[PDB]
Amino acid sequence: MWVVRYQSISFISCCLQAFKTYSIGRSSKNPLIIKNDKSISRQHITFKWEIKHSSLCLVNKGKLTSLNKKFMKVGETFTINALKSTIIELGTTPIRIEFEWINEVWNIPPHLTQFRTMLSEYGISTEISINDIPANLMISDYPKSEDNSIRELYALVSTIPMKKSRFLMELCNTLLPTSKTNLKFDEMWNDMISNPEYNVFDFDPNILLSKFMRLNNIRVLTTIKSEPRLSSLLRTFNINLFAFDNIDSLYKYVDSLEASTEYLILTTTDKKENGKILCTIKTMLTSIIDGTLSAVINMK
């Protein structure tokens, strides 16, 4: 997303909506007024971007406007590319205006498809396949989520932060139209992003992953042919992952394994059977984060 920010001193910030032609000046008719500076024209500078690749297009309408020390001629068109921030200095006393590209890509559940267009209109990208280039935010409704979902698994192991879906809907419903009405986008974002009632879990991502190390050296034996083929996610935690065509083929292996060998079995279903204890991803996750794994591993 594109954020612009500048400047009783009032810190103003605002999320740039695509295709809208924005403008900074002293004239009241601007979306973003700079007060208290005569070096600032009626309409001093304008800009709009459209759907990396989401570059910003600016055109200087004011007397003094400097980008990285090179000075715009009145009317000159210049652009800012979609790293870090970029600042353009305006006026005699330089008023420093900052344009940041915050490449936000969110992984969302399918029922929230109705919000994708809006999110993209404000530079928040969404995805449904866990794809390959990681996302920075996983919208998830765990524990109210499919029992053999790999999504929470993928994010927990990828230290991607997980937030309830109301976070997504509150952002679109509230802080988006309001950031316009009060030029404090940055404060709202950081309230919403640090507000705990949108958190799925009680610990920071990397702390969550820390609870994932008691796996240590253990055999994980599974009936599940998964999206990012599981073994990948768990190659991280350096764990012997073993897959079987039907729970038959897996029960075979247990007899072959020596006694007092530790294993758990990740199956379609939570239930005890043949003395052994069979669990699913969601139960394994939960026992890990809770620490109650012991009541789920078996030994031979």
Author numbering: 1 to 7, 14 to 57, 64 to 94, 98 to 315
Authors' text:
Here, we report the first high-resolution (2.38 Å) structure of the folded domains (FHA–BRCT1/2) of Xrs2 from S. cerevisiae, which will advance our understanding of its functions in the DNA damage response and telomere-length maintenance. The loop residues Asn7–Gly13, Asn58–Leu63, Ser95–Val97 and Gly316–Lys325 were excluded from the structural model due to weak electron density in these regions. The FHA domain is comprised of eight antiparallel β-strands, whereas the BRCT1 domain contains three α-helices and three short β-strands. The BRCT2 domain, in contrast, has six α-helices and five β-strands. Firstly, BRCT1 has the smallest B factors (all-atom average of 72.85 Å2 for residues 118–157 and 175–224), whereas BRCT2 has the largest B factors (all-atom average of 92.84 Å2 for residues 158–174 and 225–315). Conservation of this charged region suggests that the homologous phosphorylated Sc Sae2 peptide binds to the same region.
The MRN/X complex is a multi-protein assembly composed of MRE11, RAD50 and NBS1 in higher eukaryotes or Xrs2 in certain yeast species and serves as an initial sensor and responder to DNA double-strand breaks (DSBs), which are among the most severe forms of DNA damage. NBS1/Xrs2 is a scaffolding hub for protein and DNA interactions with the complex. NBS1/Xrs2 contains a folded region at the N-terminus and a long intrinsically disordered region (IDR) at the C-terminus.
